[PDB]
């Protein structure tokens, strides 16, 4: 790996600089190098890894949606034939997106998840695994599409089971996991009722636990609760 010669601490430092400079591809490459040092990641380091790849894949997903929309319109009745270029370029972006997802899933499988014993790390990584299979599912149309969807579901489900046993209902990782699994149900699994039920129950159980929190924890938890509410408003 091209980061093999750089110190772990230097990779982390540069990931933070790349974030400040909004250079998210660099940030992801630095964090990949840090993961490949083989040591477990701290809470802050996990969040750097997550931020970097979320921004990279987020840009790819946005571009893929633009191109997919153009491709769909080109295949409508009365549309003029413009050749293979739209499909080719959509496929190019799609392949790059799949490559990023495969890279993240590879880091999780070699060997972040298997060494993650505390709930805060294990739930975080399993949520990420569900997220990146979900992004693969968004572009999937082949024979393995059902298996891709089930891989996302399985990772989310294991994360949910751990989070319900080991974390309070206001824990921000637990809340963000529920938010994303609910989106999986709505957008991927054709299960809007499950999506709505999960978001509502998560919101209500968090509400009932806010009284235990400091002002700073309350701010963290209510921020994500508002995202759950925003989705409920969109869906109902």
């Amino acid at each position: 790996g091209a980061m093999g010669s750089m110190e772990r601490a230097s990779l982390i430092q540069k990931a933070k600089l790349a974030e400040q400079a909004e250079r998210y591809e660099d940030m992801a490459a630095f964090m990949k190098g840090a993961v490949e040092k083989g040591e477990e990641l701290s809470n802050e380091e996990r969040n750097l890894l997550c931020v970097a790849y979320k921004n990279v894949v987020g840009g790819q997903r946005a571009a893929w949606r633009v191109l997919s929309s153009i491709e769909q319109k080109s295949n409508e009745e009365g549309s003029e034939e413009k050749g293979p270029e739209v499909r080719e370029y959509r496929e190019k972006v799609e392949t790059e997106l799949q490559g990023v997802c495969d890279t993240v899933l590879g880091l999780l499988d070699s060997h972040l998840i298997k060494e993650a014993g505390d709930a805060e790390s294990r739930v975080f990584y399993l949520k990420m695994k569900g997220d990146y299979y979900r992004y693969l599912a968004e572009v999937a149309t082949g024979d393995d599409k059902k298996r891709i969807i089930d891989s996302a579901r399985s990772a989310y489900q294991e994360a949910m089971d751990i989070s319900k046993k080991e974390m309070p209902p206001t824990n921000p990782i637990r809340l963000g996991l529920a938010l994303n699994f609910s989106v999986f149900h709505y957008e991927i699994a054709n299960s809007p009722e499950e999506a709505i039920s999960l978001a509502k129950t998560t919101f209500d159980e968090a509400m009932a636990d806010l009284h235990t929190l400091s002002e700073d924890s309350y701010k963290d938890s209510t921020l994500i609760m508002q995202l759950l509410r925003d989705n409920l408003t969109l869906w109902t």
Binding site: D131, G176, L179, N180, V183, Y186, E187, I224
Partner: peptide, 5 residues
Amino acid sequence: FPATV
């Protein structure tokens, strides 16, 4: 699109 984190 719906919110995710």
